Amino acid sequence: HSIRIEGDVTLGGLFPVHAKGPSGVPCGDIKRENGIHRLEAMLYALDQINSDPNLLPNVTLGARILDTCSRDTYALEQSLTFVQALIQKDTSDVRCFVKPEKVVGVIGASGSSVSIMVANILRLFQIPQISYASTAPELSDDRRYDFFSRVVPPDSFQAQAMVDIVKALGWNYVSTLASEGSYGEKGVESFTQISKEAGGLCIAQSVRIPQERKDRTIDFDRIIKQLLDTPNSRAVVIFANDEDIKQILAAAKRADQVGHFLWVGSDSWGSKINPLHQHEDIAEGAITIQPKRATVEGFDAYFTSRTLENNRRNVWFAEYWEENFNCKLDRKCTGQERIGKDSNYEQEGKVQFVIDAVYAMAHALHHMNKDLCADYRGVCPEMEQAGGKKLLKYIRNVNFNGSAGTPVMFNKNGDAPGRYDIFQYQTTNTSNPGYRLIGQWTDELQLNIEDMQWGKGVREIPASVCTLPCKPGQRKKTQKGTPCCWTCEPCDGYQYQFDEMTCQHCPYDQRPNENRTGCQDIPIIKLEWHSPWAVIPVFLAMLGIIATIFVMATFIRYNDTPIVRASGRELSYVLLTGIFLCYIITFLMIAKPDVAVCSFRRVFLGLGMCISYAALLTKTYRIYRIFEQSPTSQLAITSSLISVQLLGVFIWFIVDPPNIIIDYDEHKTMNPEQARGVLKCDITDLQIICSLGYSILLMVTCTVYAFKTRGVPENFNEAKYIGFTMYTTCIVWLAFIPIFFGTAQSAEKLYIQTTTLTISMNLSASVALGMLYMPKVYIIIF
Amino acid sequence: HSIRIEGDVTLGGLFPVHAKGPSGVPCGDIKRENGIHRLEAMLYALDQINSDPNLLPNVTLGARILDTCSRDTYALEQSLTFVQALIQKDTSDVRCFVKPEKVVGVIGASGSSVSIMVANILRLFQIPQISYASTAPELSDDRRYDFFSRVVPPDSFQAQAMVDIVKALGWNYVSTLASEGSYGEKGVESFTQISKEAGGLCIAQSVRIPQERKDRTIDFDRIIKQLLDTPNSRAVVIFANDEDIKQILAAAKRADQVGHFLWVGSDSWGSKINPLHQHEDIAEGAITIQPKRATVEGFDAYFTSRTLENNRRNVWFAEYWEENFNCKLDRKCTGQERIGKDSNYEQEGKVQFVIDAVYAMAHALHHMNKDLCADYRGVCPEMEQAGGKKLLKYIRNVNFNGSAGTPVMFNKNGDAPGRYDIFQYQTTNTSNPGYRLIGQWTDELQLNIEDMQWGKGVREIPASVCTLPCKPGQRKKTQKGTPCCWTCEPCDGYQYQFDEMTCQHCPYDQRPNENRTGCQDIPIIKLEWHSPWAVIPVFLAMLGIIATIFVMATFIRYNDTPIVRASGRELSYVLLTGIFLCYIITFLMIAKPDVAVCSFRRVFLGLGMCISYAALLTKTYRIYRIFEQSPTSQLAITSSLISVQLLGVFIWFIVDPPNIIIDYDEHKTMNPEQARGVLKCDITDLQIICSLGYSILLMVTCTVYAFKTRGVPENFNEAKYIGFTMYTTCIVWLAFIPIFFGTAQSAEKLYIQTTTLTISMNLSASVALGMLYMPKVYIIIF
Q1: Where are the strands (E) in A430-546, listed by range?
Q2: Which candidate, B318, B279, B751, B776, places its Cα nearest to that of B553?
């Protein structure tokens, strides 16, 4: 039934001695991997606690060992067996008793479901509970389970360690695989939750492995095909058992896979040579996480020294001895004393945990006893009355060293901190085909990157980023898809990227560079005489300078002889100055100064043109008045119209400020690399047209009066010369107007109007001086 | 200890027989309002079940009555006593047994905490439970508590009924008041949750009433002052006990309150005369919800017929007899038999609920027994082995009539549906000062609006809507504040409301109406001769029509006399037609037709203006050539320039399409009701300027020609007449330009330009007509 140990204070015990069998009987056959060893460990722990005078010197500690048979309902009934001893008041019945057996705490509930049941039934009675093998993450809410403690970390910490190894090594794609039950599902669920909370990691695959049959070998192919769909995902995490991964490796080998994606192992994988077989090539480079293992020396000596007649408290020892050696009292066994020799047994890794659990219970009870009473040698009566939340609070705050090197403690939630060491498999170049230690995980991840290479490769050989990092000078973040990985699209070349996150439009009037760092147009467009067509007008202007160097040559000496006196002296001075004025105007407009000094230039062509025709205007009237029937009079009338032209530009300056702007924008998308810029002062088509139109108005009223001049027998050579010039002048004016219309649609017209205007002035002036200087050469040769 | 009744099948019982007293003893004195009455009701229910052959004919039913002492821990201890009889296996001890007592179900757990505790301990062992007095809303989750049932509705249904009464009657502002404990807080919490889910209602006040003292009388003033802050909130809901509301009403009465806001009562209020005293005026009109009450006849007769010697199963009956009459075996009582005579006791309202609970349990067991086995007369062995979820499933699906008229049923969650009836207080017009029924609430709210008149006025006198309807013809919805109630603001007057929730801009080119329903501008602006200043030009045009009937009068007969022959015949015909052409032009421009007929009018002043000066042009040239030294030739040269004017309008027709648009937009914000509109064809400032500017050139030439003509000794009156007219027209043409510019900035210049143009054309022709008039009168005199 149950082992009973005498003592003034006792604590209960739950262990899975037997295993469930058919549907009828609750439990059938016994199990040796976890059945008897844990009981013997607890018995040894109690014995050496009672022997040690350091802890509980004057007071002893008892216990009540008991089995659970791995059944939820059976566990509930047995747990009720602990508490009924104190709850029962009395029984009104007689047949024709026993000590109260006051329990203080309970140690057991190895599984998961039996743990939840015992916690739920002992939360109501307020009794502390410490488990040693319960790894389910559900038993982690303090509010849901008040009186509950664990000395073994849950799977949440394992998930945290894995996501830390993935993050540190550098990866983005991870595939989750799990087996049936309540272990694989919860492990991957915790893994996804941590990844989403921490950020920077995502899940791309999610497959589930049922267990409806064992002779299929088809669903494995389906999942390996599902995983092979994306060649980029080269890292997977597994939560399944050894058989599942063994089949997965076998399928990968028979499928002749070349990518050889990496594996990340879970506690089920660990460090065991059995699973790996003929798959050493494909399993290489697997990162596995395994709990630390420690071997004690006292328990092994204790268990190896016990025999049938030595101890009688244990009720299952005889049945274990029968089942271990397979002999019943058709083979009989008497006094073998070879338990540690015939069977090559090895102690399990949970022995240290039950020993530590008993230690934590004893230490908390000792501290509570010291604080409750210190003036009493033995057991003070106050201790029996005091119990409940006080003992739980003392259990939470404890810190000491147990059998293993590592200490034991409890955090806020109530579970022990996770401590693991990372292993890896290397065979192609390692001296030892076995696993080698590469790092540890206690509170912060500590891993040696350069220590792991698995041969013919650098430690960061695999890459799983879901996108090649685009940094060629163009970048942009797209919200489409999961935030995990980003896709970049080439945005226009007419602006640069802003904050490496978007393609904003850069300010105008300046082109962008090539690497998308700045938006500036260094090159500019300036007019040149040699390169553009402006050389020919420049040459024409130079040719005109030679002509005026000869007309004025025979003027300095020929000023008093009675030969030139036929022509008016006052008129001769007007034409001399008018010819020189237009020569300087063509030279000024050819030049393009950057500064706002064009004001002195606009008057050269605006006001300088009137004084050129002024002499011609009064000359026709003077020779016409003698035909119809005071030299200073003709001088005054021409001087007046000069004031009109001179005052015409003065009022223009008062109308609007003469602001000069050199900035210009091409605004052409055909060639983003091209940047056309033009600088001009007061560039208006109407301004140049109306200024030039003044001379045309006065020329019309003069030509009409010149029709009757033809045929007068006064000066045959002079009359015939003037008539020829008139037709030429109107020709160039009439062709000027059609030019600007229907041509300014392009962007290169800023420098073509200047050139054609330059030759127009030279041509109109050359014909004027040609006929004027014709009579001058007569007195030279003749 | 506990009453035990023999039977093959038994069910447990929990009742609060005793009450907790000092800290030491769990329970002290007994209570008679709920202690013994419920036990006797259950005993009477069991007896009549055993007597009735309809249910369980061949099989009897037992029970185990037991007390809880209103302690959670004691309830746990008793629950363990219920379950141990079947869970315990054996005990290895001897003293020098009892029936197994297999329980099937449990009826009890009146309170709330003891209910939660019993549910938690019996959920694990899978035993059904039915409660009768547990009203907490926490015990309503099927997943939290599997094996649990209630025959009394929870407070969630009460909250649902209240929010239905508030919504149906019409209200928006409600204030929540609650008392201490886990009853008031949960009631208002449910009320808030339903209101937020259903929508259309809100909470504006939330106060809490502590219970640390009873002699303060300050917190009541604090809350009543907090409630009196907003006069709009005239409806409040209360969840407190009778003492609290009694204090609240007293404070309202002593505070001299005039608003007299309404009250909504809860189950604690009910229909009693105790809660009202001298506050009848201010408490009038309180809507209270109460559960239905029914009185049975069998239990009362059963209880009134029992004495000490009649029944011995009950163990607390003797103590109850002692405490009821206050006699101990220093006053002794023997055989009074006046339990129902000395004390005017009345049964409680929960008797029917325990009777129904027992009925439901009996029916479910009978159905399960009938369904499991039907070929056996007595108790079939299958029933003992069958138990667990099956009995719960049969309990959920049951429907029958109990002691009361209403049936009992369970929904999916597991609690009975709510049934209440609405009461109200009236003491002004009603003959009976007590409450009167006004409606019922079982599944849908059924309330008689016209049957309730509180405050000595119309029924729907009070309203609390946070605001007036605010529908003056336009509205806007404001998101600020809680969506429950809204605030309205007047939006701009230039558009109407859209969807009665926003003020969007209506299409322009018209005006909105005053009621903000449509956006249309019916009125238009048209030029009138009578109202605007256009009368004077119209009169001037009529005057000119009379004048021209005199110039052509003396032309038909005076065609052969040797007096008129001095003037040119061809010239006379030119001026005769020109005068009539301009007369028709001024009349056409005066009229404003909407149709596309203005094309014939623009030519009257375009082409008809040149023909007027054409005769004047060749007239001066003809008299000018005889001074410098073929009538048909002079006719031809004038006919040529007329063709130029005729072709001038022709090329304008092909240049741009003659599109006529009558629509116009004032776009004036000064007067939103004003809508100015002008319809003109080909309204262009430059078109009218250039058409009139053409004649200026020829007139200027004629002016200079006539000026030089003066001084010729040829004519006396004719030369003087033509000299004056050349000096009169220049004045009006020079003044026409100043008024044209710097004045078009307004919108009323569309009709002022025509009027001044009409008078200008008339006066420019009258001077010529007057010049022709002088020779006419001269020849008449001569």
Answers
A1: 435-441, 445-447, 497-498, 502-503
A2: B776
Closest among B444, B442, B439 to B424, alpha carbons compared:
B439
* Dist CA B659 CA A337 (whole Å): 124
Cβ neighbours for B31, distance < 8 A, ≥ 6 positions apart: B16, B17, B18, B19
Q: Write the CA distances from B202 to B162, B194, B265, B465, integer angstroms.
A: 13, 10, 18, 11
Residue ranges of E strands in A505-632: none
Contact indicator for B172, B485 with CB cutoff of 8 Å: yes
Handedness of CA A323, A328, A333, A335 (dihedral sign): positive
Residue to test with chain A: of B78, B116, B124, most A Cβ within 10 A: B124
Q: Burial, B621: exposed, middle or buried (Cβ in 10 Å; 0-12, 13-18, 19+)?
A: middle
Residue type present at position A696: I
Instruction: Give the number of other Cβ atoms within 10 Å of residue B373's Cβ.
Output: 15
The alpha helices in A656-751, defined as continuous H runs, are 685-705, 716-740
| Rg, chain B, Cα only | 56
CA angle, residues A334, A336, A338, in degrees to nearest 5 = 160
- A31 Cα to chain B: minimum distance (Å): 24
Nearest to B263, CA basis, from B174, B345, B187, B197: B174
Beta-carbon contacts of A380 under 8 Å, excluding residues fewer than 6 positions away, are A372, A373
Closest residue in chain B to residue A119, using alpha carbons only: B124
Supply A287's token pair. 């990162």
User: Cα separation of B369 and B81, whole Å?
Assistant: 26
Residue A367 phi, psi (nearest 5)? -65, -40
Q: How far apart are CA A642 and CA A637, in angstroms?
A: 9
Q: What's at B233, amino acid-wise?
A: S
Domains defined for chain B, CATH in brackets: 3-89+97-127+296-330+343-405 (3.40.50.2300), 155-292+420-451 (3.40.50.2300), 467-523 (2.10.50.30), 535-663+680-781 (1.20.1070.10)
The answer to whether residue A384 neighbours chain B at the CB level (below 8 Å) is no
Q: Which residues contact A540 (CB under 8 A, 6 or more apart)?
A: A758, A759, A762
Residue B169: alpha-carbon gap to chain centroid: 17
Given resolution (angstroms): 4.3
For residue B332, the 8-state DSSP code is: -
Three-state SS at A198: helix
- A120 Cα to chain B: minimum distance (Å): 8
Known binding-site positions of A for L-glutamate: 112, 133-135, 183, 267, 350
Separation CA B407–CA B410 (nearest Å): 10
The Cα–Cα gap between B158 and A76 comes to: 39
- The experimental method behind these coordinates is cryo-EM
CA A229 to mean position of chain CA atoms: 25
Integer CA distances (angstroms), B508 to A341, B500, B504, in order: 106, 21, 12
Annotation: binding site of B for L-glutamate: 112, 133-135, 183, 267, 350
Which of B209, B157, B219, B221 is CA-nearest to residue B178? B209
CB atoms within 10 A of CB A341: 9
Contacts 24+ apart (CB under 8 A), A59-62: A59/A8, A59/A9, A59/A369, A59/A378, A59/A379, A60/A7, A60/A8, A60/A9, A61/A7, A61/A9, A61/A10, A61/A11, A61/A362, A61/A365, A62/A5, A62/A6, A62/A7, A62/A8, A62/A9, A62/A10, A62/A11
Q: How many CB pairs under 8 A join A and B?
A: 50
- Cβ–Cβ < 8 Å for A503, A491: yes
Three-class SS of B427-444: CCCCCCCCCEEEEEECCC
CA–CA min distance A94, chain B (Å): 7
